Amino acid sequence: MAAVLESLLREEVSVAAVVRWIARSTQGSEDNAGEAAALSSLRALRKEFVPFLLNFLREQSSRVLPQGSLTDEPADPARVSSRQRLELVALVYSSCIAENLVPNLFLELFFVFQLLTARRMVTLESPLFQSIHDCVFFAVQVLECHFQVLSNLDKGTLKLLAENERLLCFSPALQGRLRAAYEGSVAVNRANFSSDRAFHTFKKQRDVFYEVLREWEDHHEEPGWDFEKGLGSRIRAMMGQLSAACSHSHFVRLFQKQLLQMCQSGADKLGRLWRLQERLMAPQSSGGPCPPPTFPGCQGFFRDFILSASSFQFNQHLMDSLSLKIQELNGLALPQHEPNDEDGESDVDWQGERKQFAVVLLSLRLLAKFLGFVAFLPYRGPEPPPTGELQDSILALRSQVPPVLDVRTLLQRGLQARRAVLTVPWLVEFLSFADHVVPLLEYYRDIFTLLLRLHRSLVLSQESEGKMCFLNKLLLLAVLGWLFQIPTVPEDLFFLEHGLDNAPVVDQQLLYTCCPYIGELRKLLASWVSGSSG
Amino acid sequence: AAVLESLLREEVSVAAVVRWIARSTQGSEDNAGEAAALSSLRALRKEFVPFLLNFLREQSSRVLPQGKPSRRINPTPVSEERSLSKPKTCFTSLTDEPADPARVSSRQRLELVALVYSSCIAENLVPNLFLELFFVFQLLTARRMVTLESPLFQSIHDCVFFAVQVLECHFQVLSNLDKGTLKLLAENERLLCFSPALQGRLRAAYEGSVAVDNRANFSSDRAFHTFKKQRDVFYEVLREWEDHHEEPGWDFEKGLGSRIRAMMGQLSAACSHSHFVRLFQKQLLQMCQSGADKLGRLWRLQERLMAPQSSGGPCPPPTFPGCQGFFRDFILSASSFQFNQHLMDSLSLKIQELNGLALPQHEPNDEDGESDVDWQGERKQFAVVLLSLRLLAKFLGFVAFLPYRGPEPPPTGELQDSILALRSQVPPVLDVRTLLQRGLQARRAVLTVPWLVEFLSFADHVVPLLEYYRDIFTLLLRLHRSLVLSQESEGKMCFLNKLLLLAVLGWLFQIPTVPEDLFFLEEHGLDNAPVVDQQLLYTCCPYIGELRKLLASWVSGSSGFMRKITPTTT
Amino acid sequence: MAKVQVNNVVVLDNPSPFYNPFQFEITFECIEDLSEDLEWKIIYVGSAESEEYDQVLDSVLVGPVPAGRHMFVFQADAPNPGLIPDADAVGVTVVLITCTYRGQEFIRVGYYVNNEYTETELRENPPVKPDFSKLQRNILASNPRVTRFHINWEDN
Amino acid sequence: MAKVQVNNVVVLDNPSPFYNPFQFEITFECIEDLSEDLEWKIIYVGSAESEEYDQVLDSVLVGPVPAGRHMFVFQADAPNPGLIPDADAVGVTVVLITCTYRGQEFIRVGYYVNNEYTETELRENPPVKPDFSKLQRNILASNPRVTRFHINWEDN
Amino acid sequence: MAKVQVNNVVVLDNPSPFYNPFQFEITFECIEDLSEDLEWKIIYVGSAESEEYDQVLDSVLVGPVPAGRHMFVFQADAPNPGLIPDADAVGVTVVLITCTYRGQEFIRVGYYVNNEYTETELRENPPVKPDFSKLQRNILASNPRVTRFHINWEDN
């Protein structure tokens, strides 16, 4: 293992050969005899070279990155020691990232930015990072290869990258490219209710539900407001009164309708105020380009509601309604544009269709999320896999009840029909709320294997005249890497042995709404700038 | 009524019409006139049997009611300084007309109607055989009249004659009933008066019957301690119930709901629901499934105390008798999604495991009696298995459909497609259709059907409309129509197995949830062994005894305006 | 000093159609275990002019009677209509309870009963004949009269 | 949600001869108002062998029943000794107290009754033919065995 | 089941010049004991265009926190006017008060701050170059906008 790392560092075997060997690529006629023989001999050590490589960089980064009068010594590429080793390691890292060997592309990009944005050291044998010069050079060398991903990021993050001093110092060409980037980027009824007493009771319960929601809206941001003490008694009384007169179906329909209606949702002073208001609801800010699943904003309320309800009847009806709605939405035709002519008079049409799709997808995500929240609610808990053995009883017990939603069949049909962009994201949202014992059942094991195969088939460098647009690839790769980096999913799982998709349907706004952790990159730069002034 | 009247004229033979209703193939012996008439009336088919049954219900209305010193009072020592015991103010001729077959009017008409009724019941055209047998017994034990045009029941003589005529055909079913009911039929006076031969055969049958844990399983250590505490609490509440579940006024909710809910909460806290559900199911199976002359008499008395509800006829609604009741209440009082889901998973696992047991039965070789134990062993084994299965299935069907069950009959003819679409999505908790199909294919109906019926009896009013359960009910209907208690093909299914299956299926098809029109809608191995005995038949179907009660009732009432007491206020 | 001391006499089924047996739930206090047995007897005043028409409903005997706060419920039959003089019975009469200890009486209770008809016509045009088909007796006014007497509690 | 609930039942004077009438005090708590009259019954188990010898002592109708806690008594005539078989006369039997609404039963509070001989020579020498005049019936009121069923308490 | 919860926050010097230090009163209720030191921070958004101009006013390390309602003060120096751009100096901005535990943030009680000119001539004639000496900061304490996240409060 360490031996293979040293052999690569000595250049006996080319970096391309080892990366191809890790990727299980077919052995071509051009393969060299010595390199092929060495890699075949070490094949027994395959499947763990890459995680060890990541751990090695993480450990050596500890001295350059804190935790995991003083002047600021500017970083210059002249005072660089062992430049050859750093360049080789950066090239190998870039090859690994570009082949999707790593689980989360943006996690690796975040680490690269952290190396590029190191302030000062904190107090094979020789470490690979002797000074900020070495780490900055490594980061810039790796980032040089990855330009398309950066080019398609936000306009603001592009600007912060543009004004960075270290990038100019180490790679002026890259800066001229990302400058051109920022440049262009800125250039752009009585029948339903049985009997009549039931109808009246449903009217009262709907009134009470809207009353409690209005109370939440008025009071869900003031300090000290606890949802339980505030609303649990009322929600539980409503659940009881609704179960009494068997009216859970109508209330769940109203609940889902409102969920979709609400969650999915000087002039200069108003726009700046909107930006500030976005700042108020900004993500966790703590860090991590792969944050755990969470309910931001209005969605939070509903989660709390379900938790406070604690009702078998309401939970079952909600599960049924959400499954039905998700299946209905996933089957929408969503006729996308036909790329004919360059006429701009049809401008509106594009956006129309695009927006439609975005709406649909977002709704799906939301619904799926709540479904995955309630379906696995009884099983989720701080109980990691019991142990290596004695768990066959648990797997047998939990492998019987059929899944609430046939997610495997939906995923397979979507992949076969080339609707991955619409079918995968909400499946990932659904699975992110699993427990610690789901990534072991044959059903969900096959689901995860299929997701792994799909992710390995999504490389952000190829083009075959209309396979999959770049931004679609970015969205799917980001969501899949985020899925594969949740604590519930075992770390070893990844290391185990025409059509909507073809047309462009995800744009920057949709990408940043679906994945509100790309901004992390921007945040890092901003932090640096702030800490540059401080 | 026109077809009924035409049959009454003897234009078409009873056998011909009975075979025509069953959609039997037209043989070469079919008569031209009868075949033509039946083909013409085919438009009125599919409801002739229901119409005949209804006709008997209306015409039976006239036969049944409707659709010196003195004592000494040793005062009770119940001082109990309390309530009104407190101080206050300054206190400081109608004869029984015996039934005789001589006074019978339109004997031919009664005979034809009785023969048609017997043919219909014996061919399984009717949904529940024992419901019809109970009705026949009710006719047989009619006291007096209460104050096409001519009624078919002019006097108690006519109804008694009809009942005995119907019973004549059915002897095997009666012969295989309990000893007590056989005795009551044998000693019955009306049978001797109207049919000495049937009473003699039943007397012979009665005489013949008389001649017979660890730290590894529990993650962490807090979970282990809290699970021990909750097991102790569960056993405490169970003991409290056992001690106090029959004293008047003891309500389960007020008594135990707070404790059960607190247990539920702390157990959900440390994610230990699986182990508690294992304990719950183990206790359920262990408990619910479960001078010498003085002990036998005490057993008989104790059976009398816990006899099922007397109002319920031969098709009582599903219920939890005895210890089972507790557990139902428990499930109701917890009202926890987590516990309910874990219980459904555990019950599904146990049902799947039990239903697949091999249960190698005896090979019927030789007549040696030395192998007695072996017979007993295998039979008992099967019985145990079956009973356990039934119990588990019942509770599963109780909790799976709990969120949907309610006093909400089918919404209406239309506007319900939304409900069916909504309810056709979630897969069933247990793949009952596949299990039923595999059981029927493998010839294990006696073991696979009863627990399926227990599971389905707790369905909803919208379950018989789903495609899945609609197909399940269609398959059960075909199976029930395939169980005729007169045929034999050298080893298809022993008689008592047929009786048990037919009784359970008829009871299922006479539950309010199942639509009445569903049954009348358009159409080696564990089985085939003497695995079901009288004890098992009466344990699986504790409503056959209804027949016995009826007879007993009559006898008692042979020996025997109420009052208007007004309740005292607070 | 008396060993017996009634403490109430609940009337059961106060509004009752005719022919319904009289019901009385008595609760009485015993302080010492008297050897003999008490004798509770219930009287319906058939007519208001003389006692020859009085009909003894029934006379139960009670014992043994240990010390404590004991009670019972007594059910007497309906009055015999054969000896009824005339409609005077329909007038408010009295039903009384007397208990004879040592064979001597020491208490009476007055419960004037409004023997009232059922049909409205029967009140507007009541028949001269004392028709017993419809009537409402046993309606007790709930008046606890106590005619205590100094009965001799001889040891023998 | 049973419209009618039941609470402690006290059988009055459980120690009595075989001819003494039964006496029960039942305190049934009704939640809201009923539209008809409860039907209470006594079933005396003449023989444990079968129901063939069950004796319906007396059926009473109780109403009207507006909301509130109510109680009453159910005096019924003693069982006819003629019907009771020979062997089962001296043994222990059961008496069932049932209630029904719209011909539907919802409570069957039972009772284990015992039948001894008071005088010692009869127990020492049990006569072949039971003589009902000298038997003592004791109702074990301390261990009632109730059973409850669920019925529809609808308006019609 | 977070060990630390937060309640009403009272900003005292809500009316102040642009150079006056901030002053907040946070009433955080801790349920059980913590194993480390709570870390509070204030982030002043210098410009609404981007985070590039965010100013970390001061980070405090406060953890003497037995269960109970607690208090402290979070005075921090005013933001340096040099870094804040020109356009965003005169407009309305927001100040975020964040808290972290084990380097992990779990509450972001915010505040809408406004920056006017006191003198009437300044509002009438807004100078091209902002003069922070005469700028007035008003913090809208009546409409706090808090957001809460769930974290693992484990031992280690």
Residue numbers in the entry:
A (entry chain B): 1 to 68, 285 to 339, 355 to 419, 439 to 515, 535 to 766, 782 to 818
B (entry chain A): 2 to 68, 192 to 216, 285 to 339, 355 to 419, 438 to 515, 535 to 767, 782 to 818, 823 to 832
C (entry chain D), D (entry chain C), E (entry chain E): 1 to 156
The authors write:
To understand the interactions that mediate CDAN1 dimerization and ASF1A association, we determined single-particle cryo-EM structures of the C:C:A complex. 3D classification strategies allowed us to obtain cryo-EM maps at overall resolutions ranging from 3.0 to 3.5 Å of a CDAN1 dimer with either two or three ASF1A molecules clearly resolved. Surprisingly, even though CDAN1 homodimerizes, we consistently observed asymmetric assemblies during 2D and 3D classifications of our cryo-EM data. The asymmetry is explained by the association of two ASF1A molecules with one CDAN1 monomer and a single ASF1A with the other. In addition, this stoichiometry matches our SEC-MALS measurements supporting the predominant presence of three ASF1A in both the C:A and C:C:A complexes. In our cryo-EM maps, the two ASF1A molecules on one side of the complex appear to stack on top of each other on a platform formed primarily by the MIF4G2 domain of CDAN1. We refer to the ASF1A proximal to the CDAN1 core as ASF1A-1 and the distal ASF1A as ASF1A-2. With our cryo-EM maps, we could model both MIF4G domains of CDAN1. This showed that MIF4G2, including a conserved central extension (residues 645–675), mediates dimerization. In this placement, BDA1 makes canonical interactions with ASF1A-1, where the consecutive basic residues R825 and K826 interact with D58 and D37 of ASF1A-1, respectively. We assigned the previously identified B-domain sequence as BDA2 that interacts canonically with ASF1A-2, where the consecutive basic residues R195 and R196 interact with D58 and D37 of ASF1A-2, respectively.
Codanin-1 (CDAN1) is an essential and ubiquitous protein named after congenital dyserythropoietic anemia type I, an autosomal recessive disease that manifests from mutations in CDAN1 or CDIN1 (CDAN1 interacting nuclease 1). CDAN1 interacts with CDIN1 and the paralogous histone H3-H4 chaperones ASF1A (Anti-Silencing Function 1 A) and ASF1B. We find that CDAN1 dimerizes and assembles into cytosolic complexes with CDIN1 and multiple copies of ASF1A/B. One CDAN1 can engage two ASF1 through two B-domains commonly found in ASF1 binding partners and two helices that mimic histone H3 binding. Based on homology searches, CDAN1 contains two MIF4G (middle domain of eukaryotic initiation factor 4G) domains (MIF4G1, MIF4G2), a three-helix bundle of unknown function (DUF3819), and an MA3 domain commonly found in MIF4G proteins.
